[PDB]
Amino acid sequence: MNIFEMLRIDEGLRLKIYKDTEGYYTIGIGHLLTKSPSLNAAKSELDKAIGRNTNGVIGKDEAEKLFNQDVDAAVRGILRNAKLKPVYDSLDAVRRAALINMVFQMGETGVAGFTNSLRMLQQKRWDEAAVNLAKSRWYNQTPNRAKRVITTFRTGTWDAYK
Ligand SMILES: [Cl-]
Ligand SMILES: [Cl-]
């Protein structure tokens, strides 16, 4: 198991514009297109992102390409973030994947806001951090995905994904 396969399980793959759990226009592997309600503003972003007139539909290769960019951007945002970097540096390889997963889903800003959990992760207090992470809209809104990520943090293994 690796970050890519982990996120692929969590986000799925859709080759036509769809709406995410929050109601936003998305495509491929969890690639947010716009928060705007307009399907046309979504097709426009889509075409800008792909470099061709897509008519709302892409191929597998195109989806995977967006996904590669997105993981890369997630990692780089963590490394540039003053709150996130120290956490990431302190963690083992599996737990690093779990932090990347949160950032891919909620953005650097959102994760950076989990102040207390971040401090517990840094201190390696696994069980306590798992408890604190659960008291979030995040866990309340996407409980099955949140539990998987949380278990990854608590245990340090890929169990929840096997
Ligand atoms: Cl893009
Ligand atoms: Cl879920």
UniProtKB/Swiss-Prot annotation:
It is found in: Host cytoplasm. Optimum pH is 7.3. Substrate binds at residues 32, 104, 117, 132. It is an enzyme of class 3 (hydrolase). The keyword Glycoprotein does not apply. Signal peptide: none annotated. It holds the Pfam family Phage_lysozyme. Changing residue 20 to E/Q: Loss of 99% of enzymatic activity. Gene3D superfamilies: 1.10.530.40. GO terms for biological process: cell wall macromolecule catabolic process; defense response to bacterium; peptidoglycan catabolic process; viral release from host cell by cytolysis. The keyword ATP-binding does not apply. InterPro entries: Endolysin_T4_type, Glyco_hydro_24, Lysozyme-like_dom_sf, Lysozyme_dom_sf, Phage_lysozyme-like, T4-type_lysozyme. GO terms for molecular function: lysozyme activity. Changing residue 30 to A: Almost complete loss of enzymatic activity. It catalyses: Hydrolysis of (1->4)-beta-linkages between N-acetylmuramic acid and N-acetyl-D-glucosamine residues in a peptidoglycan and between N-acetyl-D-glucosamine residues in chitodextrins. HAMAP family: ENDOLYSIN_T4. Belongs to the glycosyl hydrolase 24 family. This is Endolysin.
